[PDB]
């Protein structure tokens, strides 16, 4: 588990703000409520990267089946949004958590990106 660079912290805060703003302007009238969330994180992912949302109940939005093992391992070690971190898993790297408010619901936001 590794400390973020100032640039990585700024990027996360910036992305969390854009995801929060997107959701604030997107009415929650979907038949599939999670699709609204996927629209926001698909749109604001940085090039070549993806975003994940985790609910307070421990459910992951945006992940592939192949990724649940490393996502599980990472979050099992992660701290609060007061101390986001990063970890490499072979060819990918997980970064977070960041924080996304959506009305009364709160999510943790993670980035998944090619490792470097």
Residue numbers in the entry: 2 to 117
Question: Would you copy out the relevant sentences from the publication that reported this structure?
Answer:
While CpxA contains a PAS domain that is largely similar to the PAS folds of other sensor kinases, CpxA’s “non-canonical” dimer structure regulates its ability to sense periplasmic triggers; diverse inputs that disrupt the stability of the CpxA-SD dimer appear to activate CpxA kinase activity.
However, this helix does not form the extreme N terminus of the structure, instead containing an N-cap motif at its N terminus and an extended tail region that folds against the β3 strand of the main PAS β-sheet (see later in Results for further discussion of this region). Overall, the monomer structure of CpxA-SDEC is similar to that of the CpxA-SDVib, with an RMSD of 2.9 Å over 108 atoms. While most of these are hydrophobes buried within the PAS domain, asparagine 107 (N107), lysine 121 (K121), and tyrosine 123 (Y123) are notable exceptions. These residues are also located within the deleted region of the constitutively activated and signal blind cpxA24 allele (Δ92–123) and form a hydrogen bond network connecting the α3 helix and β3 strand in our crystal structure. In line with this, mutation of the M48 residue (M48K), which lies at the main dimer interface of this structure, did not lead to significant changes in the activation of CpxA or its ability to sense alkaline pH or NlpE overexpression, and CpxA M48K was expressed to similar levels as WT CpxA. This was surprising given the importance of sensor kinase dimerization and led us to conclude that this dimer orientation was likely a crystallographic artifact.
